[PDB]
Amino acid sequence: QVEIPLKVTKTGGSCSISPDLVWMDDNSIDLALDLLTRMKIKAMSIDI
Amino acid sequence: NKFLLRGKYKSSGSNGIPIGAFNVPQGSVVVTAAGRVLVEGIDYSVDYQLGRVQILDPSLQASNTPIEVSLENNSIFGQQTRRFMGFNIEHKISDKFVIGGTYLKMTERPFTQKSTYGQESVNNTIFGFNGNYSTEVPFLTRLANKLPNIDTDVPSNLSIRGEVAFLRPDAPKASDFQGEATIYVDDFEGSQS
């Protein structure tokens, strides 16, 4: 499970919003799979 | 949905191995029995137009050993352009010693800049060295002539072939997003029919 809190694009004014504001880099998921492996190894020691 | 029915079935139909391709190019068929490469005139024969491979070795036929057949298939469509380049060196050290230095590169040209999962392009390079030493050993013939009822005269031969290869794979720069090799799990352009 990969979760990211989302920043909301500000609306109300013009319909046309620049792509850098439509697709914020703060909202982009960029996940290293080695982090998933580390989490899996750590959770091996966590009881259900 | 975690229970899996896994299996295999064998399809023969008629004599000869159906390799799944027709009009295979000559010299593109490689047959491997148990890690060793067979000989195209002794262990097996190839009927190229029908794509049939008939195993000739009596011991391999009654073996149950899985036989791997590799070939080139021209019956392809909708594939990316493949560029194949390289060079091969064949230095001759002596009358019975040859050394080689092959280098090869295949680059696939993707249709667009987006490579979806499964339809991936490669930019692979392979380079290696090989050595072939084929000598004649009359000592083996002399030893054979010391056997009870053997009075032969055919020459005895020895052949040693060594080879090392290195594969450096990559993806073409055309299917790169912001400088990284990218495979699209879902660009979402193919949904909503």
Binding site: - | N1, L5, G7, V69, N73, R83, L104
Partner: protein, 192 residues
């Protein structure tokens, strides 16, 4: 000096015992191709279809503007092949069929094979191959491009730059017939 001059009806025999500094003989000189003869010849047929196609389907739901279709029909049926030599050094083998199958049956091979004393031993243009006597590094048979062979005494260098027209395919066979593996899940029953 009679052997050096050459025009004495017998000097040709004596030229062998001469120092090669004093004469030049053309028997061991060759042009870019071995001769000036042209022998590349065509064989086969070529067909032109030029005519009119007229169609009329009486579908009332169709627009009146689609009452009938009158088009020009043009068709080509090339069934040609080219075989021959240029100057006993260039070899040409080509085959073009419009009715052939998809992409590889139309062949074209130009093979330039110089004398044994040249550094360049072989040039190939068109349908070429790169056969390798290697198990780890496989070559390719179905290539279209340029293949060049160079020889420096005992070092042979073969370079290729081409497009591969085939795909490598592997099968596994036991006791003759090919083996097909299958993987189904419980949800994948034969439905309806």
């Amino acid at each position: 000096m009679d052997a050096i001059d050459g025009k004495k009806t017998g000097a040709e025999a004596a030229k062998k015992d001469l120092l090669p500094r004093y004469y030049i003989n053309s028997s061991l000189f060759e042009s870019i191709f071995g001769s000036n003869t042209i022998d590349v010849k065509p064989t086969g047929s070529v067909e032109m279809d030029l005519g009119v196609r007229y169609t009329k389907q009486d579908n009332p739901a169709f627009s009146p503007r689609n009452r009938s279709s009158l088009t020009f029909d043009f068709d080509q049926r090339i069934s040609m092949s080219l075989m021959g030599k240029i100057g006993t050094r260039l070899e040409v083998n080509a085959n073009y069929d419009t009715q052939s199958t998809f992409a590889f049956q139309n062949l074209f091979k130009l093979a330039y094979t110089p004398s044994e004393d040249d550094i360049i031993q072989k040039v190939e243009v068109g349908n070429v191959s790169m056969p390798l006597n290697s198990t780890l590094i496989r070559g390719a048979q179905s290539l279209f491009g340029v293949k060049t062979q160079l020889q420096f005494g005992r070092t042979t260098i073969t370079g290729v730059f081409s497009e591969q027209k085939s795909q490598t395919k592997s099968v596994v066979a036991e006791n003759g017939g090919t083996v097909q593996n299958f993987d189904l899940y419980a949800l994948d029953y034969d439905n309806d």
